[PDB]
Amino acid sequence: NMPMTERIRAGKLFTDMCEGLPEKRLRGKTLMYEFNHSHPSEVEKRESLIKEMFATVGENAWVEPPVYFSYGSNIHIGRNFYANFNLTIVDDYTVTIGDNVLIAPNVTLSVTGHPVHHELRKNGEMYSFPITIGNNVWIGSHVVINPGVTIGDNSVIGAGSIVTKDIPPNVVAAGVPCRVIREINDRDKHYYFKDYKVESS
Amino acid sequence: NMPMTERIRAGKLFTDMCEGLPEKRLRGKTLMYEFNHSHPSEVEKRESLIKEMFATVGENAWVEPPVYFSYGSNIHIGRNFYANFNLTIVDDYTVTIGDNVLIAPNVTLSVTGHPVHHELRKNGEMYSFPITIGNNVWIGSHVVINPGVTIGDNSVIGAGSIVTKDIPPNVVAAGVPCRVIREINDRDKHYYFKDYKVESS
Amino acid sequence: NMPMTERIRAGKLFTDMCEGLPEKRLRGKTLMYEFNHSHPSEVEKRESLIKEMFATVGENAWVEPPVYFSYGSNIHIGRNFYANFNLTIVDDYTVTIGDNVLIAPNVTLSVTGHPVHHELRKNGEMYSFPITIGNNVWIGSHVVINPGVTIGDNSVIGAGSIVTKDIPPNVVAAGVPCRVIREINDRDKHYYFKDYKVESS
Numbered sequence: 212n213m214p215m216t217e218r219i220r221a222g223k224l225f226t227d228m229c230e231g232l233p234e235k236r237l238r239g240k241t242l243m244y245e246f247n248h249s250h251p252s253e254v255e256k257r258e259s260l261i262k263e264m265f266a267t268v269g270e271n272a273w274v275e276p277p278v279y280f281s282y283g284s285n286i287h288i289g290r291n292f293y294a295n296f297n298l299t300i301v302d303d304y305t306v307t308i309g310d311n312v313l314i315a316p317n318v319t320l321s322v323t324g325h326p327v328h329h330e331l332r333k334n335g336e337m338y339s340f341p342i343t344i345g346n347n348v349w350i351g352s353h354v355v356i357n358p359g360v361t362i363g364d365n366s367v368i369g370a371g372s373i374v375t376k377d378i379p380p381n382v383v384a385a386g387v388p389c390r391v392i393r394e395i396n397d398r399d400k401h402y403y404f405k406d407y408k409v410e411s412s
Numbered sequence: 413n414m415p416m417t418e419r420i421r422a423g424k425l426f427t428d429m430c431e432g433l434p435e436k437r438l439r440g441k442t443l444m445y446e447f448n449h450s451h452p453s454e455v456e457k458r459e460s461l462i463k464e465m466f467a468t469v470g471e472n473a474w475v476e477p478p479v480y481f482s483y484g485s486n487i488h489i490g491r492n493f494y495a496n497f498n499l500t501i502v503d504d505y506t507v508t509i510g511d512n513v514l515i516a517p518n519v520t521l522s523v524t525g526h527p528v529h530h531e532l533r534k535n536g537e538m539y540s541f542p543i544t545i546g547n548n549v550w551i552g553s554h555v556v557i558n559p560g561v562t563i564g565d566n567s568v569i570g571a572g573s574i575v576t577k578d579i580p581p582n583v584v585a586a587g588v589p590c591r592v593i594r595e596i597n598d599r600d601k602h603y604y605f606k607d608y609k610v611e612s613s
Numbered sequence: 614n615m616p617m618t619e620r621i622r623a624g625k626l627f628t629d630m631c632e633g634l635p636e637k638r639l640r641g642k643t644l645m646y647e648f649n650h651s652h653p654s655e656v657e658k659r660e661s662l663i664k665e666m667f668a669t670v671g672e673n674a675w676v677e678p679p680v681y682f683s684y685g686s687n688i689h690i691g692r693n694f695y696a697n698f699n700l701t702i703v704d705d706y707t708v709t710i711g712d713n714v715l716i717a718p719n720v721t722l723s724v725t726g727h728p729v730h731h732e733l734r735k736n737g738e739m740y741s742f743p744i745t746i747g748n749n750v751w752i753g754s755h756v757v758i759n760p761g762v763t764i765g766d767n768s769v770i771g772a773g774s775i776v777t778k779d780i781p782p783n784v785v786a787a788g789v790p791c792r793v794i795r796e797i798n799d800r801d802k803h804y805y806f807k808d809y810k811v812e813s814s
């Protein structure tokens with residue numbers, strides 16, 4: 212009701228069957244289908260495919276296929292990135308991942324949400340809001356990060372949580388919905404798992 | 413016990429290694445393997461493949477691969493259906509989806525379940541109860557819909573919820589387990605997301 | 614530090630880019646890639662592939678592709694095993710599954726975890742603790758079993774739960790996080806689902 216890409220940028224409802232958006236996705240799903248079917252030994256092909264797939268990729272990135280996204284060109288990753296099986300990034304808009312981020316299996320990231328009232332989405336209306344994942348963050352298995360969310364630096368996201376609100380840095384958050392359960396302190400510098408202490412050398 | 417398929421229709425426990433069921437499952441996993449490995453540019457092949465896979469398909473359906481099901485023939489879908497990545501439907505029995513239904517990535521629908529008592533499932537005994545999804549329904553990411561569940565028209569299922577009980581129409585529901593959190597009213601006709609209003613034209 | 618494999622067996626922090634671990638993973642993803650890309654009709658190639666993939670496999674095993682794992686060799690499985698779509702086992706160390714175990718679609722098992730304090734994982738430091746799954750257990754859809762977890766015999770794990778603590782045998786557990794909701798008694802020997810009783814013949 213004004214150019215479509217102009218509304219995406221302002222957070223207004225839109226649809227994406229025009230302005231070359233439908234082809235930007237085809238170019239994208241085409242590079243993804245090549246990465247998902249690539250033989251595990253095709254390490255070079257893979258290492259280079261992920262450079263083409265994402266808009267920005269820092270050095271030392273590794274993504275265990277398969278990966279799924281809408282357009283790959285809206286995803287910006289930092290250094291030493293590591294993602295496990297089935298990462299899904301619905302990136303109809305900006306998705307920014309910081310340095311040293313670790314992603315567990317089956318994680319879903321989405322900047323897109325639809326209007327709750329069935330009347331506002333008769334034609335698949337949608338809204339998009341940037342997701343920002345800070346540095347040295349660890350997202351557990353089966354996590355879901357919602358639109359417009361920001362995970363503060365160094366934080367950890369419990370497996371299975373649905374993140375719907377900004378998450379502050381240096382905390383351990385979890386739950387449905389996701390809540391900060393505690394702050395990461397010095398006790399965590401010694402106790403890495405349950406009752407096991409890192410008898411440092 | 414009486415014809416296995418007869419038992420399926422009655423809601424009795426049963427095993428599916430007979431009466432041609434194992435081959436009906438082969439015919440379907442065959443079509444599904446062709447859909448999931450199809451190249452993104454094979455638009456015509458996909459469109460016609462989804463007409464073959466499911467029992468009934470309304471016009472304007474679109475399923476983003478991959479898709480996973482037991483048999484394809486027990487799934488009935490209405491108009492303008494849209495499913496995102498990895499939709500899984502365990503349809504050992506009828507699964508019915510209405511019109512204008514929207515499915516987020518990684519959703520699981522299952523008519524089938526097993527008896528909790530280990531002595532009752534020694535031989536993979538199971539039960540199947542039809543799932544009915546009303547018109548204009550939006551199911552969020554990572555949701556799981558259990559057997560016999562009925563989602564009412566215009567309702568919205570929040571990401572990550574586990575639906576074990578019917579959801580009335582016109583509501584926003586969520587949680588583990590799912591519960592109605594509020595009714596969708598006219599405020600949702602103006603405010604589509606958080607604090608952003610549809611300054612309607 | 615100490616030989617890396619020696620640390621794994623001890624429950625000490627480690628990394629896995631040495632001692633031939635990277636190649637044990639390649640031999641693994643290769644067999645896996647073959648299994649996930651096989652035609653639903655290549656029943657024999659599949660049957661024989663799972664015997665190659667996993668360390669130990671009992672008779673009458675079935676795994677609906679796709680399956681995902683770190684190394685195949687660390688997973689041991691009993692008799693009559695059944696895993697639906699997208700089972701994921703992050704077995705950087707041992708994973709033992711008993712007899713007659715049934716697994717729903719989209720289940721994630723991980724023996725590995727990372728230190729909570731970002732300073733302890735600069736180089737992808739990780740820890741591994743075996744996961745033991747008792748006999749005649751039934752795991753629901755979208756379940757995540759964390760490191761060092763033991764599921765007791767004859768137990769049931771509701772769909773969508775995040776298991777972080779051992780589960781006693783003969784119970785029905787569920788939730789985020791998981792919790793014993795009740796013990797499985799003789800009532801379950803009669804009522805298999807909600808209000809449907811097995812009118813025993």
Ligand SMILES: CC(C)(COP(=O)(O)OP(=O)(O)OC[C@H]1O[C@@H](n2cnc3c(N)ncnc32)[C@H](O)[C@@H]1OP(=O)(O)O)[C@@H](O)C(=O)NCCC(=O)NCCS
Pocket residue numbers: 314315316350351352353367368369370371372383385386392405703723725726727729759775777789790
């Ligand atoms: C975050 C994590 C590492 C541990 O957090 P922690 O502070 O050291 O754990 P704690 O036991 O002290 O947590 C405290 C409470 O929160 C609960 N909790 C922990 N993780 C939770 C989760 N993901 N969801 C919900 N509740 C959770 C605990 O069960 C515990 O319950 P209680 O208060 O009744 O006793 C672990 O929970 C986790 O989820 N890790 C992700 C593993 C994964 O996905 N790995 C994939 C491969 S990298």
Ligand SMILES: CC(C)(COP(=O)(O)OP(=O)(O)OC[C@H]1O[C@@H](n2cnc3c(N)ncnc32)[C@H](O)[C@@H]1OP(=O)(O)O)[C@@H](O)C(=O)NCCC(=O)NCCS
Pocket residue numbers: 301321323324325327357373375387388515516517551552553568569570571572573584586587593606
């Ligand atoms: C349903 C949804 C659109 C928003 O519902 P809403 O009524 O407008 O949201 P509200 O903030 O008013 O919800 C009220 C409360 O419920 C909680 N809540 C919202 N969604 C929840 C969910 N999925 N699970 C659990 N709790 C949830 C909120 O955190 C809030 O907490 P509070 O009571 O402590 O303040 C959003 O939560 C959602 O999950 N969308 C799905 C997105 C998705 O999966 N997209 C994939 C691509 S389409």
Ligand SMILES: CC(C)(COP(=O)(O)OP(=O)(O)OC[C@H]1O[C@@H](n2cnc3c(N)ncnc32)[C@H](O)[C@@H]1OP(=O)(O)O)[C@@H](O)C(=O)NCCC(=O)NCCS
Pocket residue numbers: 502522524525526528558574576588589716717718752753754769770771772773774785787788794807
């Ligand atoms: C475990 C299961 C079979 C039923 O357990 P049950 O004891 O017979 O069920 P109940 O209704 O008596 O459960 C009691 C309570 O726990 C809740 N509950 C049940 N399953 C739950 C789950 N997975 N997560 C959270 N809460 C759950 C119920 O909603 C109910 O709520 P209430 O106390 O407010 O009334 C079912 O919940 C389930 O999740 N099955 C898995 C199905 C699946 O994944 N199938 C895939 C193909 S095999």
Ligand SMILES: CC(C)S[C@@H]1O[C@H](CO)[C@H](O)[C@H](O)[C@H]1O
Pocket residue numbers: 227281301303323334335337494496514515516
């Ligand atoms: C026809 C629409 C549902 S569009 C569809 O919605 C998806 C989320 O549901 C993603 O945002 C896709 O990129 C978008 O094209």
Ligand SMILES: CC(C)S[C@@H]1O[C@H](CO)[C@H](O)[C@H](O)[C@H]1O
Pocket residue numbers: 433434435437438675677
């Ligand atoms: C190896 C057998 C369990 S048979 C096998 O089971 C599958 C479901 O698990 C499908 O039904 C196949 O069609 C059937 O041949």
Ligand SMILES: CC(C)S[C@@H]1O[C@H](CO)[C@H](O)[C@H](O)[C@H]1O
Pocket residue numbers: 233236237455472473474
């Ligand atoms: C059936 C049409 C909506 S087209 C379909 O829509 C998808 C997004 O929903 C993708 O853009 C596909 O590339 C496009 O062909």
Ligand SMILES: CC(C)S[C@@H]1O[C@H](CO)[C@H](O)[C@H](O)[C@H]1O
Pocket residue numbers: 428482502504524535536538695697715716717
């Ligand atoms: C041998 C059985 C576990 S059968 C198996 O159970 C699955 C659910 O667990 C699905 O219902 C399959 O379609 C069914 O064949």
Ligand SMILES: CC(C)S[C@@H]1O[C@H](CO)[C@H](O)[C@H](O)[C@H]1O
Pocket residue numbers: 272273293635636638639
């Ligand atoms: C790019 C490297 C981290 S290597 C890469 O790491 C993977 C796990 O992340 C697997 O171990 C591969 O087999 C290995 O070659």
Ligand SMILES: CC(C)S[C@@H]1O[C@H](CO)[C@H](O)[C@H](O)[C@H]1O
Pocket residue numbers: 293295313314315629683703705725736737739
């Ligand atoms: C570089 C590491 C993140 S290693 C990486 O971590 C994964 C879990 O996050 C799995 O354990 C892989 O097998 C392991 O190589």
